[PDB]
UniProtKB/Swiss-Prot annotation, chain A:
Ubiquitin-like modifier involved in formation of autophagosomal vacuoles (autophagosomes). While LC3s are involved in elongation of the phagophore membrane, the GABARAP/GATE-16 subfamily is essential for a later stage in autophagosome maturation. Through its interaction with the reticulophagy receptor TEX264, participates in the remodeling of subdomains of the endoplasmic reticulum into autophagosomes upon nutrient stress, which then fuse with lysosomes for endoplasmic reticulum turnover. It is a lipid-anchor. One of its GO terms (molecular function) is microtubule binding. It comes from Homo sapiens. GO terms for biological process: autophagosome assembly; autophagosome maturation; autophagy of mitochondrion; cellular response to amino acid starvation; cellular response to copper ion; cellular response to hydrogen peroxide; cellular response to nitrogen starvation; cellular response to oxygen-glucose deprivation. Residues 59-63 are annotated as: Important for interaction with ATG13 and for autophagosome formation. Signal peptide: none annotated. This is Microtubule-associated protein 1 light chain 3 alpha. It is found in: Cytoplasmic vesicle, Autophagosome membrane; Endomembrane system; Cytoplasm, Cytoskeleton.
Length: 127, 125
């Protein structure tokens, strides 16, 4: 806890996935994933920056079949966060994109995927 | 005998009711008379049914205000009560923080014709 006179702080890392790996490493990972699972979408789902009433997700990486709509994914987040009904949340795709719950993620992927090939989503409460 | 002629007002977006040349011309006149104001087109999101249509779609906004000011203005014209939540989307689906200055949104998202297009929708949609 103290090394060489220095007092070390051990707080856990809250990095977004994009800040933990390099662009080359993320691209490399997507290609491996799209090779073994060409019928699934690699989705990164993280907590919005300024969120306060909502807890962090324990698992933020999801391999999703092409055919499921956003509803099917929202309810997954509904189950993983185990939220109460009076606490409403929204899911933004990529950077600030509100998309219809009936849209298949396969169209969302090809329209909104990141430069690295991942599809980034964030959940928030309001504002 | 003859024809059944039907006349109904248009609910088509502003971009389809006004030519490109007229829209460009209108912004040019407005930026000349009002160089410190932002011309914003605010319309109801296409598949929206919970919130009504507004009688005014064209808004001349001071360039110094934040997105918050535009939300409060639309909320008032929609006469919403606190239990009614809505979003104001830039372009078609872009969510922006209410603290973002409208001038920054304008220079980043304005249309080629000089207007800034926004739509309002409720969480249901």
């Amino acid at each position: 806890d103290e090394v060489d006179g220095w007092l070390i702080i051990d707080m856990p890392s809250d990095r977004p996935f994009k800040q933990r790996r390099s662009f080359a490493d993320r691209c490399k990972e997507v290609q491996q994933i799209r090779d073994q699972h060409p019928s699934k979408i690699p989705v990164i789902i993280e907590r919005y920056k300024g969120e306060k009433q909502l807890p962090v997700l324990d698992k933020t990486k999801f391999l999703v079949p092409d055919h499921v709509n956003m509803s099917e994914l929202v309810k997954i987040i509904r189950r993983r966060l185990q939220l109460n009904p009076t606490q409403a949340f929204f899911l933004l795709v990529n950077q600030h994109s509100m998309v219809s719950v009936s849209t298949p993620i396969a169209d969302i992927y090809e329209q909104e995927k990141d430069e690295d090939g991942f599809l980034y989503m964030v959940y928030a409460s309001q504002e």
